[PDB]
RNA sequence: CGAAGGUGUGCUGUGAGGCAUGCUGGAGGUAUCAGAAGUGCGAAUGCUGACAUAAGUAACGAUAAAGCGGGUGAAAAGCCCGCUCGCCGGAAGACCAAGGGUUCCUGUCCAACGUUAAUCGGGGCAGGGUGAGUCGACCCCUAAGGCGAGGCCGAAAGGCG
RNA sequence: UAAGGUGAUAUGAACCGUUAUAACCGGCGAUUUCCGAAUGGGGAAACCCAGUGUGUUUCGACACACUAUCAUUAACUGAAUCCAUAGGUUAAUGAGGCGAACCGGGGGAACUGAAACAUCUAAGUACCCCGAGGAAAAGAAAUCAACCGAGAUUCCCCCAGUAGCGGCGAGCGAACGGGGAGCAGCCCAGAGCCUGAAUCAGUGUGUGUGUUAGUGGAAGCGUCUGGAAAGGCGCGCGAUACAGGGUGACAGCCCCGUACACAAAAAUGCACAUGCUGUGAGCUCGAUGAGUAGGGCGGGACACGUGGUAUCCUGUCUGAAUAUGGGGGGACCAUCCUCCAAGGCUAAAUACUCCUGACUGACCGAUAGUGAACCAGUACCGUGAGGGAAAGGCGAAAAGAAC
């Protein structure tokens, strides 16, 4: 599915309301990209399929805790 | 706690033999008794030549609803009803009038 | 003329019969919507 | 019985097993021949059985 | 085989003209036996109980009938019958 | 010493109605004043059951075809036996697969079933009947196609492989 | 518990028992073929074919056990490539499926209404999907109020068909505040001191209490009518029992019962007690949730349809302050008040009935009442999903009509 490994995003839903408003089902999908990060205590590239946000938090946080978050909800990187 | 049991004398309360006292022979199920003299149907039967069954009209006795019965008293000469007491540790019946058991 | 129902049992069977049923989700429902009625046989079995 | 038979080692059960179903076999060989006045004596033997059995299983068992 | 499993599979002798038949003139016996039972264990259990020679068993099953009982349709239920062959040097008995 | 209900008859009210009572029935009914309503039927091409009507009329399923003697039997145009006649014969014959599932064979029965009778039957009831190393299925091998560990994908279910 | 029994249609045969190994009722056990999540492989469900390891046995084969996947942990193994990882094998622990309604989340209509119809409505309903528990969800203020104050949530009645929203149409519809049901508060983002010290969970034992079989359980006769009395007439008695059912018509006193008074070898529900092991109290000093708040763009949720629209959620692009601080108070700004987001747990009052027991009804009485009073989700119809009937009453007793 896409789903941001990182942030859990997902994909949303809503409407086209038009100029005459009327509504329309559609969905907001997540940006995501297949992405080869560098893990240097692991001394490896971990490939992380993430949003721009995604990519964003972990360049604030650090891949090891990110990593370390991966681990912890239990779900395979 | 059954009160009418097998080889009892009873007399009849109801039916076309009112007054009239007998042996239990059997009790069935459903709460009918069979006894002694008692209720004499007449039946038909279609002679059975295998158990050398001849025909003809076979006075039998017809069950009786126990309701309609009673424990004769052979001391007092009445009907009774009956009671149970624990005599010894045993589980005994005994005559309501004069108390005295069976 | 030729009619609609030409048997057979082979065809029967794969259609559907009990296995067939229980490969899928649907079928499942199926089974589950017959054994909620009490049906006495659910599916098409000798 | 039950009491009788408790108090057989499990050899002697066995034995007595395979003369029980011995017995079956021929009273039911008997009834199929038309050759059974008591029938009442197929029930005792295949209950027997059954209590036989019952015990060797709680002597393995426990 | 074990013994124990030889003693439940033979139910009953099967009477009939067919079987009077091949008793006398093949020197053949007619059993029901039970369902499951195979043409080895039959071989086993004539030899063993009946204690004579077995040449070879021939099987067949019968479908039971249909039967109406009061308006209600019953099924009679499946059985197994075996014609069984008997070396020749034996001569039947009946228990 | 006879309730409700059914059927009559008689009387009485402006009316829906009421009372009494002969037969039937064989155990429930209910005054009075109040209370609550699944409260009143002829229609709805109304819904269910029952019975009419046309009418003892049309029809009895290939225009291949029957006739006689004897048997059985309550009763024989139709059943069995014999004798002639006639039709199919690249089938109206014989053997399978499919599909059916006991319809097979014997005895017995004739209510219903059989478009008539039926003593007959693919009908009823009881019994019997299907014997495999080498015929099939199983099994070994794969086709199209299916399912599909991991895997790829997808809001979830799931899709593809 | 017991003098009767071997379920029913349903007789009989053959038996078992009568003072407690007959039967019957409950507690724990044993067995529990095959199919089915189906789990050794496959498969047209109830079948087809195995492998490995024990164990015999005259050595013909037989018995018995293990063998699914997936998650997690361990152990051993182990490429490309040196370390390493991936990968591979064994082992232990758990999951999978079913099920009525209720519950939270993920998706999500149209008919209809508007006397047409697109916004709106219907309605976040039907339906689909995931997850859970006996309840769930919610929940300890970055909450409201109004210069006086309240003090988590859920639920009921008001406020109020008001304030508002709305092609200002059709419609939709609050809150503040008040009365009640119920009431309970906690921990992590860290050190020191005193340490098993509150709580809570696991387990034994005790008593008490409920459940799962059960025991006792009042007092009536005569007479007429009649097939039969329980009905009429006469004289009684019981009542902490005149609930109800059955018996040849309508019985307090014939039978079952009913009020009342009792009982558990064993298994289980709740209580305190007490022992136990695991869980840590209290105090002092600290600390105080960042790609977050807000913002831009696009949607959605708030009664509130972008409107002057606060407030919450986020697909997208961004982006702070850290108690000398931040949020809210219906655009917005200043003043005044209040509150501390970005971490987490929490009983009760609330919703529901596949199912067990008891009681009841100005509910029906066989075309009604469940589709189903009867062997009914049956026959029968459909390839299938599915559809889906008809059918109660001899009598007191079969005495069911010998000849």
């Given at each position: ?73 239990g779900?395979?990187? | ?12 309360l ?36 295998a ?40 589980k ?11 | ?20 049923r229980?490969?899928?989700?649907n079928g ?19 | ?7 057989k ?54 | ?40 264990e039959?071989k ?52």
């Amino acid at each position: 599915s896409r789903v941001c490994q990182v942030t859990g995003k997902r994909p949303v839903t809503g409407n086209n309301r038009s100029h005459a408003l009327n509504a329309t089902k559609r969905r907001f999908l997540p940006n995501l990209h297949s992405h080869r990060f560098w893990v240097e205590s692991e001394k490896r590239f971990v490939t992380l399929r993430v949003s721009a946000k995604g990519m964003r938090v972990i360049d604030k946080k650090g891949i090891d805790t990110v990593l370390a978050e991966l681990r912890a909800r239990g779900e395979k990187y | 706690a059954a009160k009418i049991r097998r080889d009892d004398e009873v007399i009849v309360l109801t039916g076309k033999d009112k007054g009239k006292r007998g042996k239990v022979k059997n009790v069935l199920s459903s709460g009918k008794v069979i006894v002694e003299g008692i209720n004499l149907v007449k039946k038909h039967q279609k002679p059975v030549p295998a158990l050398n069954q001849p025909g003809g009209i076979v006075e039998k006795e017809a069950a009786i609803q126990v309701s309609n019965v009673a424990i004769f008293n052979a001391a007092t000469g009445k009907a009774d009803r009956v009671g149970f007491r624990f005599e010894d540790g045993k589980k005994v019946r005994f005559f309501k009038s004069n108390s005295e058991t069976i | 003329m030729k009619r609609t129902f030409q048997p057979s049992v082979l065809k029967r069977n794969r259609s559907h019969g009990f296995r067939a049923r229980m490969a899928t989700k649907n079928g499942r429902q199926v089974l589950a919507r017959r054994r909620a009625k009490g049906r006495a046989r659910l599916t098409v079995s000798k | 019985k039950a009491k009788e038979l408790r108090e057989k080692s499990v050899e002697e059960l066995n034995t007595e097993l395979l003369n029980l179903l011995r017995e079956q076999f021929n009273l039911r060989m008997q009834a199929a021949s038309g050759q059974l006045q008591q029938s009442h004596l197929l029930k005792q033997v295949r209950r027997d059985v059954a209590r036989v059995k019952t015990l060797l299983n709680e002597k393995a068992g426990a | 085989i074990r013994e124990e499993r030889l003693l439940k599979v033979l139910r009953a002798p099967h009477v009939s003209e067919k079987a009077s038949t091949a008793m006398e003139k093949s020197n053949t016996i007619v059993l029901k036996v039970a369902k499951d039972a195979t043409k080895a264990e039959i071989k086993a259990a004539v030899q063993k109980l009946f204690e004579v020679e077995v040449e070879v068993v021939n099987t067949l099953v019968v479908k039971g009938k249909v039967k109406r009982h009061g308006q209600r349709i019953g099924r009679r239920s499946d059985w197994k019958k075996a014609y069984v062959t008997l070396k020749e040097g034996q001569n039947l008995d009946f228990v």
